Amino acid sequence: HMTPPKAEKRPYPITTHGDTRVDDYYWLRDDERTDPQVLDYLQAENAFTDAALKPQQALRETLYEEMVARENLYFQSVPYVRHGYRYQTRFEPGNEYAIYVRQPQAESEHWDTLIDGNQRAEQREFYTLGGLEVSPDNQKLAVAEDFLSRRQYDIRFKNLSDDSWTDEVLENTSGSFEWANDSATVYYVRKHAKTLLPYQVYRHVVGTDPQLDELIYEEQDDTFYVGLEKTTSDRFILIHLSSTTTSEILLLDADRADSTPQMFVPRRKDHEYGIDHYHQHFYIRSNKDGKNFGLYQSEQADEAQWQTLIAPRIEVMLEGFSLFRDWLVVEERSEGLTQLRQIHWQSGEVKRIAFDDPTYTTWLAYNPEPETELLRYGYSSMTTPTTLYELNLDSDERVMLKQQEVKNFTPENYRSERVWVKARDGVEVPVSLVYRHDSFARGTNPLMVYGYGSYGSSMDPAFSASRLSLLDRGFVFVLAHIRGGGELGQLWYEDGKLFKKQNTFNDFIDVTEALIAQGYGDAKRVFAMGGSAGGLLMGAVINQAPELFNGIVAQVPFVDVVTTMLDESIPLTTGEYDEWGNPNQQAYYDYILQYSPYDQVKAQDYPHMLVTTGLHDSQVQYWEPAKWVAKLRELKTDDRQLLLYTDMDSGHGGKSGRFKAYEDIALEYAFILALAE
């Protein structure tokens, strides 16, 4: 019916290694975001998306309403104790933001407000609480707040005794700060006013002019993120320096005045380590001897002195640890499962935390105090809503502290399976899927196949209440644990990045083909979704295997890969040479160009597709998906739906603009449900 927008073509040649690529839409990039022709094209496509999806308004309403009616209005966090006070977070209906309260641990009846997000947001356009921590003496509250939506945080201090605010503000910070043990001094991280990269650590005396703050440390390499931590012992504040590949920690004595940074272990390429300090020892998680990491104990910094507690193992990835009075507890991955193990400091007794679910995730939750036998850990499966447990590490007593509440939900209505697919190279790829039992008939059901598959991030199988809107309409929902993710440890990550990145896209296709072959879904109604680096996935897969999918949602997709990775002026490019590679090298130019979705768009039939992006703020810059859609409209040979939806907004809402997140999910789900009908 309707004529889609047609972007003007302006042939823009880019020549590298004597290869000339001609980019007809280079001009959709305006770093200033004011070119009126660039805004006209984005607004035109939004108007086309509006007009094309107008008939789905009723369905979007039904979806929105049933998603919001699943979740409670009142949320109360599980209370935790820290330094003799009990803390709870509270959301009332009508209140846009959290209220943070506390009481003395020995107290039940009365709670004091620490901070009311609604009060703090009064007469502001935007509010996000980035951080909240009371000093060790329980007398002062430090808060990191963002009033301007650019994740530059202001730090302010409140005297809890008389609820009065101090006069000063620490400006343009990462929101990362730590109290010295004097409850008078804080360390905090200043962003580079230009790059916005966290680069400087300062010491501040609370009450005083931030002019008098002392520069403690400045990071020289802008691939190294600067973070602050405080050891379980409270003896050290950690300056945590990391690239994607490489760590370095500096120690600040948290007890004494005029501390300067003390090197732990100098940075060495491809050595990642993190430390804690407890019971007069350093504990270190390090890949020095093995990609899957080991855990070491040491009296001092010197790497030569580190004693092996847990050796690196090819079949077990060591993800993190917590330290308690009598136990070490570690989070690991093995055979495609997250796992928790406990080891007694004295007896060396080992226990495994057991579950009975094919598709679940477990993790260490918040454990602020080490002098206890009570471990808090989280659990979620494709069929069991997210649960906090408290485990007695000595007695094995396991009590539920909180369950995610889901209305109109009967858990036994759904089934889940773990499936292993032999990929085209003989490698075994795990898959997690879930469906409604009473509407399942082999070879009949639409499939929704979700992937990410970059940075070693895992799509761990867990519960989603919004997913019930697809399951209750006959969909089989699949997580494809493709290479480039972390589900089978560091090797699974490395086998889907740099000169192996193609395995990511091949795994997604291999999984989809197998699931259809084995009768999990209807071959004519296979859908897929992926966002950001998962949008790169969507883009490569439709160029390579266009006929496999009926319809796609590609959120904020990374698709202009070669051109973006050739340009250091784009934020992220300098940090990502260790992910995709550096196309200033001909080997990486050729390898990346082979899959770069914008470059590999051809005159062939594509699936129906909804593409999303955002003008004002960017992980992926808005222009990549805009150029992608313009080029697809120019070359694609089919007559299927292609829509571009650009968020024009100023910024977000109550933390994650929850209203609006559900509206976006409803629009994407109506689009897929309309195609599956």
Numbering used by the authors: 1 to 677
List sentences quoted exactly from the publication behind this structure.
Oligopeptidase B (OpB) is a two-domain, trypsin-like serine peptidase belonging to the S9 prolyloligopeptidase (POP) family. In this study, we described for the first time the structures of bacterial OpB from S. proteomaculans (PSP) obtained by X-ray for an enzyme with a modified hinge region (PSPmod) and two of its derivatives. The enzymes were crystallized in the presence of spermine and adopted uncommon intermediate states in the crystal lattices.
Finally, the tobacco etch virus (TEV) protease digestion site (ENLYFQ*S) was introduced by site-directed mutagenesis instead of amino acids 71-77 (IPQQEHS), forming the first hinge peptide. The hinge region modification included the substitution of the functionally important residue Glu75, which, according to our previous homology modeling and molecular dynamics studies, participated in the putative interdomain SB network stabilizing PSP in the closed conformation. PSPmod was crystallized in a conformation characterized by a disruption of the catalytic triad together with a domain arrangement intermediate between open and closed states found in crystals of ligand-free and inhibitor-bound POP, respectively. In the PSPmod structure, the distances between Cα-atoms in the pairs Ser532–His652 and His652–Asp617 are equal to 18.2 and 10.6 Å, respectively, which are longer than those in the closed states of TbOpB and ApPEP and comparable with those in the open state of TbOpB and intermediate states of PfPEP and GmPEP. In PSPmod, the His-loop location outside of the active center is stabilized by hydrophobic contacts of Met648 with Leu42, Glu43 and Asp46 residues of the α1-helix from the N-terminal loop. Gln619 was unable to form a SB with Arg151 and the latter interacted directly with catalytic Asp617, the interaction restricted His-loop movement and prevented rapprochement of His652 and Ser532 and consequent catalytic activation. In PSPmod, Sp702 is situated on the surface of the propeller domain near the η4-helix. Three Sp line the surface of the interdomain cavity of the catalytic (Sp703 and Sp705) and β-propeller (Sp701) domains, and Sp704 is located between the domains. Sp703 is remarkably close to catalytic Ser532: the distance 703C11-Ser532OG is 4.11 Å.
